[PDB]
Amino acid sequence: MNRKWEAKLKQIEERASEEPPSIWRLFHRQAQAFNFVKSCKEDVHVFALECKVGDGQRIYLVTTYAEFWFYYKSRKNLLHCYEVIPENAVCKLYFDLEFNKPANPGADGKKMVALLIEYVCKALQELYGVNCSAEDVLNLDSSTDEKFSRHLIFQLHDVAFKDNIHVGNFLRKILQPALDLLPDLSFLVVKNNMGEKHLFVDLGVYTRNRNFRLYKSSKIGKRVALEVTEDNKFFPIQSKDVSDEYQYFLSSLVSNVRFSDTLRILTCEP
DNA sequence: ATGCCTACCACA
DNA sequence: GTGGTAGGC
Ligand SMILES: Nc1ncnc2c1ncn2[C@H]1C[C@H](O)[C@@H](COP(=O)(O)OP(=O)(O)OP(=O)(O)O)O1
Ligand SMILES: [Ca+2]
Numbered sequence: 607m608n609r610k611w612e613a614k615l616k617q618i619e620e621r622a623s624e625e626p627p628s629i630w631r632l633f634h635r636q637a638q639a640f641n642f643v644k645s646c647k648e649d650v651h652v653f654a655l656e657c658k659v660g661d662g663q664r665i666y667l668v669t670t671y672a673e674f675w676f677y678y679k680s681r682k683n684l685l686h687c688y689e690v691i692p693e694n695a696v697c698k699l700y701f702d703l704e705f706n707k708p709a710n711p712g713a714d715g716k717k718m719v720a721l722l723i724e725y726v727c728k729a730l731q732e733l734y735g736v737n738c739s740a741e742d743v744l745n746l747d748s749s750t751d752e753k754f755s756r757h758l759i760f761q762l763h764d765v766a767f768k769d770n771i772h773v774g775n776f777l778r779k780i781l782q783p784a785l786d787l788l789p790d791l792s793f794l795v796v797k798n799n800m801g802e803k804h805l806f807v808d809l810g811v812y813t814r815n816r817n818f819r820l821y822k823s824s825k826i827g828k829r830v831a832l833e834v835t836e837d838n839k840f841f842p843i844q845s846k847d848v849s850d851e852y853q854y855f856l857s858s859l860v861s862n863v864r865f866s867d868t869l870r871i872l873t874c875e876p
Numbered sequence: 877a878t879g880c881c882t883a884c885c886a887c888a
Numbered sequence: 889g890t891g892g893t894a895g896g897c
Pocket of ligand 2: 702703704755756808
């Protein structure tokens with residue numbers, strides 16, 4: 607309720623101011639886009655598009671995964687797109703990983719990713735009995751000369767988290783040995799620009815309706831798009847009916863939890 | 877016409 | 889300890 611009231615209170619504050627089957631609908635307000643989704647029989651999802659302005663202004667788009675990919679895959683249009691991870695929606699385990707390269711000259715980013723996956727896979731086994739390995743982790747890279755940047759999206763067989771807030775509670779729980787510095791989790795500690803210690807794992811992405819940059823999109827002011835990392839070990843099952851790139855796209859979507867008649871939903875309370 | 881929220885510091 | 893905020897995702 608405390609979270610539902612504050613959101614609805616922004617709606618009252620904002621209130622102060624034949625053909626082929628297709629569902630391409632744009633909205634200025636995120637709440638309007640979700641109101642349309644609930645009022646829509648098809649399986650549509652909310653995307654966020656960065657506006658040309660240098661700020662973080664966003665315009666929200668509702669459509670199906672398939673139609674979005676159709677108009678998105680050429681990378682000629684819809685640059686700088688984000689997935690809106692809906693609050694209270696089941697979601698995959700995912701990570702935002704970063705550190706300043708000049709400020710961490712000794713750090714081996716590739717090694718840190720493998721160690722993190724190893725530890726997270728142990729925690730999933732000890733706390734939930736879930737078995738997985740690096741072969742289940744989609745590894746996306748957006749690194750620059752200055753920044754080591756990865757997105758990991760776990761592809762767990764018939765398993766998902768209740769919502770992305772629970773993902774955050776799970777990570778805060780198992781990374782507590784590392785947060786205390788700010789099990790031996792010293793490898794996660796990195797320096798920011800100002801020499802202030804931080805964790806390699808960005809915990810700020812587990813918030814309600816978090817935007818999460820799409821596979822093959824870049825930030826508005828930049829040119830580096832998220833692409834599959836060379837050391838990626840998750841390979842989707844190939845199908846004669848869909849392209850491999852579409853399969854990677856669907857795997858990369860945090861909110862695109864594979865339908866299963868034996869799905870287990872993992873919760874983690876604060 | 878973006879949304880979210882913790883870390884941080886000043887006050888009983 | 890809470891406010892109470894603005895700085896960062
Ligand atoms: N100003 C914002 N408004 C809304 N959502 C945001 C904003 N900044 C970041 N986000 C969301 C989208 C990002 O994909 C996600 C993580 O932030 P961040 O690490 O800065 O970007 P990123 O991981 O997409 O690129 P990179 O780290 O390579 O610069 O949080
Ligand atoms: Ca990042």
